[PDB]
Design a protein around this ligand. Structure first.
Ligand SMILES: [Zn+2]
Ligand SMILES: [Zn+2]
Lengths: 539, 539
């Protein structure tokens, strides 16, 4: 819903940019100005989309959706608060001004005579008011619905200032365009649309254009011979006093906060003071320590995605089985327990860690078996053999939920199970946090049964039983298949297990990364290779 | 991975803010400056996290994850491009400067004598160079590894300028702090870290502090009686020429782009030109039309979430069944075909549209039946009765996939099926786009069989068969149950159907919004109410 503000922002910026485009060109090539009132069109643009112009068993499913509603609830409140704050600021200036008004004085006759001498050539609509003051240092103007020009008494006391003629024309020019009226109106709208900062940008740009037009007016009424004189009188405006800006709703003559002005102030100021070295020393020390503190927690880099970079403790043989894989790009690893040697296809791919998917069920079962979640006489949660054999997640998810995460972690760590990351979900092995390479599963499965003596003996073979694929006179082939599928595409096909033969004990894993990397294909591929390698021939 | 830049930004802004904090205070209360070199600490802070300081059947599942990797791929390229652009800009200025250097002239004797007269009181390390120029309008300085002060020949021609003493001290002061060295260094770092705009903010702030210190130095060497004179000589710097800023890598004396300066230029410029009205007229016209154009597509508001706001065409009776619902907050609607009257519990809740979930299977079956996706002799995709009866989504998802979306839409529209929105997914009825209220399902189911004669007769009763819950001597109760569950919480329990009795024909729906809003509960609740209402009593 807050997206509506976003839509409004886009509209605003569109119109905003178009106007800026023209402004540049017209000035750049023709020295032309725009009637700034066009900026009201942007405020209007900002409210386009904002206006609603439309012109028997139970079945259930557990869904996940992005909750962006809590965001809008919060954003709504923020918008409200910003408006409240801004209202105050507006008011602050406004109040000052009404109090200021009350302190003004009627202008007397001789001064009036001088003023008329200055403006009689306009014969204007004398529905504006000119007053003097014993307070303010320099002339100002504001609206009140009265259109007031207020001049410090010092400039009448300066009976022969001459320059009065210039300041008067300047003030006249602003009054003429009711700048002080539009400013208020504009600001009110801006206050409400607190969510779009471009409004402040426009607010500010307008002011420069206003002053430029005032200068042109004034010059139009000045004998050019005196333009220099005039310019000098302008410079004088920043030499005597600090600039002031409390009354954001009004117009002053001393120009604005600027580098030049700050410097001029600094020259006048008796600034010849010194400070102890400690000021910088300590700021620097603490700043440093604070960086140190941040560091204690902050770190990151792509290196955290590292796969099985580690060398084997023994010998391995490279093998090519690409005619077998065909389009099913992948890797293959086999290990001989008697030779203490690995046989590897695509040694680069074999090191890449992928979620184990269904082949994690192998380890999951070992863990469930040791913890008596499931056991060798009764493995029911469905049972182990059935669930492994018929692809039942209901069962394995239940085993996982009931294995203390620390037990799982203990064994994932003892066996070097890839990144040993079990995440937080009961289904952590499927396109999720726990990842392992094809080479690692061969290493890991082997250790699970042959080197790691923590596991009960029964857990080791109860698991093998659930994995039997085939048995014959030469060997018994065990393993599990499955596939990680993301957005309907099969991306991670696995077949993991072991072969005990009449000649040796083998561990293996097959992984498919592309083409049609199904579990079934990983199995078929593994079998063809294992047969070619003698594993499934009894050779 | 790009998140790393984000981490860097946070670090940067932390240190940045701390420094700004102190700067304000030290100046505000003690009038103290900082050795700006501390800003290098922020550049260092910006690289904290950046440094990698780490100190048997196949089972498969179809997963969805957020792809933020394409984003990083793109962001990487953008970063590279920004650096390329900035490199050019840097170079542009740099080249200008080397060419400029070559045009400088050695300073002669009398001028040297004057210069030494000015600086003999420093007896400085004369390893810097002073030259004059016949090109530039005002004195400048730069680095080159030479530390050069270059003064236009006009200021030596102005043999009695006097003010030379001031300009020289100013230049000396910048040379002293090697401002021109640090600027380059800083900028180079900034160019690489193109992703964090705060670097530009720092770049700019530094310059003001540099100029302030230069002024202090200069004043320290001036008889205070002349401070006024000095200040006047500063103002003169912006009266004669335009300011220039091509050489961003260097320091000039005419101050900077500013409102005052633009105005002074405008005074000198013969700007008394006029323009045709058409300039604004057409910009305004087109701007308007463009807003019109945007509008043709842009609209939004919360009103699009409207539920079943519409009154019935007949009479309805309010009923309270809150003792039945108990904690299972919900609604209940029943309709009498003979009386043409509705009986409603929680008439507000009954109008709220929710995804129909499994009860959509009712309509889905009608559609599948008419289209011969499934039929009355063979409804297999599992069959209709089984799938309805045993909660099989596999089956219904297949029916949905095979119903032309326009056919479904035709009937959703003829029956006023809530918002009639079937989205885009084969499972659009489950915690998804198609939504309908409890009151609407009663209306809609009724029309499906009693008013809408598009549907085949066989589709109407083939569906009823799959829905039979109970049959007896007084009535046959039909319907379907199910639940929308989100993030494990049951949020939308439904029971929808009809009762044909020995006295009348009833349509009904029960919906549960909170507590334990299961499908089963909606059924139990409906049955208790329907019995109390006489529907399931044959009364
Ligand atoms: Zn003004
Ligand atoms: Zn300077």
């Amino acid at each position: 819903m807050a997206k509506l503000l976003i839509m409004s922002i886009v509209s605003f910026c569109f119109i905003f940019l178009l106007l800026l485009f023209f402004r540049y060109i017209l000035k750049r090539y023709f020295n032309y100005m725009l009637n700034y009132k066009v900026w009201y069109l942007t405020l209007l643009a900002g409210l386009i989309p904002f206006i609603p112009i439309k012109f028997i068993q139970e079945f259930a499913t557990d869904i996940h959706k992005f909750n962006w509603d809590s965001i809008d609830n919060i954003c709504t409140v923020i918008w409200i608060v910003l408006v409240i704050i801004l209202s105050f600021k507006f008011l602050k200036a406004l109040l000052y001004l009404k109090y200021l008004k009350k302190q003004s004085l009627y202008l007397n006759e001789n001064e009036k005579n001088k003023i008329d001498t200055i403006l009689f050539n306009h014969q204007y609509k004398k529905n504006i008011v000119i007053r003097k003051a014993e307070t303010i240092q320099s002339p100002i103007t504001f609206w009140y619905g009265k259109y007031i020009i207020l001049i410090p008494s010092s400039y009448f006391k300066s009976v022969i200032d001459k320059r009065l003629k210039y300041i008067i024309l300047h003030e006249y020019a602003h009054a003429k365009n009711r700048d002080t009226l539009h400013l208020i109106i504009f600001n009110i709208f801006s206050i409400i649309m607190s969510y779009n900062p471009l409004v402040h940008i426009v607010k500010r740009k307008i002011i420069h254009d206003n002053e430029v037009e005032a200068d042109r007016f004034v010059l139009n009424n000045i004998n050019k011979n005196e333009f220099k004189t005039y310019a000098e009188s302008i410079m004088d405006s920043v030499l005597n006093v600090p600039f002031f800006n409390k009354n954001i709703l009004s117009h002053s003559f001393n120009g604005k906060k600027s580098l030049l002005k700050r410097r001029l102030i600094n020259i006048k100021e008796a600034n010849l003071k010194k400070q102890s070295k400690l000021i910088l020393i300590f700021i620097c020390i603490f700043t440093f320590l604070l960086m140190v503190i941040q560091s204690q927690f902050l770190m990151g880099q792509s290196i955290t995605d590292y796969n099985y970079k580690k060398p084997l403790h023994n010998d391995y043989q490279i093998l090519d089985k690409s005619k077998i894989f065909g389009s099913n790009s992948g890797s293959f690893v086999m290990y001989s327990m008697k030779k203490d040697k690995y046989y590897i296809y695509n040694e680069k791919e074999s090191r890449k860690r992928y979620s184990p998917n269904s082949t994690y069920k192998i380890y999951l079962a070992m863990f469930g078996l040791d913890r008596h979640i499931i056991n060798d006489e009764n493995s029911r949660m469905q049972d182990l053999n059935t669930a492994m054999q018929n692809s039942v997640n209901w069962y394995f998810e239940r085993i996982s939920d009931q294995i203390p995460k620390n037990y799982t972690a203990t064994q994932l760590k003892q066996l070097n199970y890839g990144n040993k990351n079990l995440g937080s979900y009961k289904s952590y092995w499927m396109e999720d946090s726990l990842k392992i390479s094809n080479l690692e599963q061969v290493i890991v499965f082997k250790n699970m049964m042959e080197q790691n003596n923590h596991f009960s003996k029964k857990a080791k073979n109860q698991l093998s039983s659930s994995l039997l694929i085939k048995k014959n006179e030469k060997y018994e082939l065990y393993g599990k298949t499955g596939t990680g599928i993301v957005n309907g595409k099969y991306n991670n096909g696995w077949f993991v297990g072991y072969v005990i033969t009449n000649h040796d004990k083998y561990y293996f894993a097959t992984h498919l990364s592309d083409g049609k990397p199904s579990g079934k294909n990983a199995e078929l591929i593994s079998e063809k290779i294992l047969k070619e390698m003698g594993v499934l021939n009894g050779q």
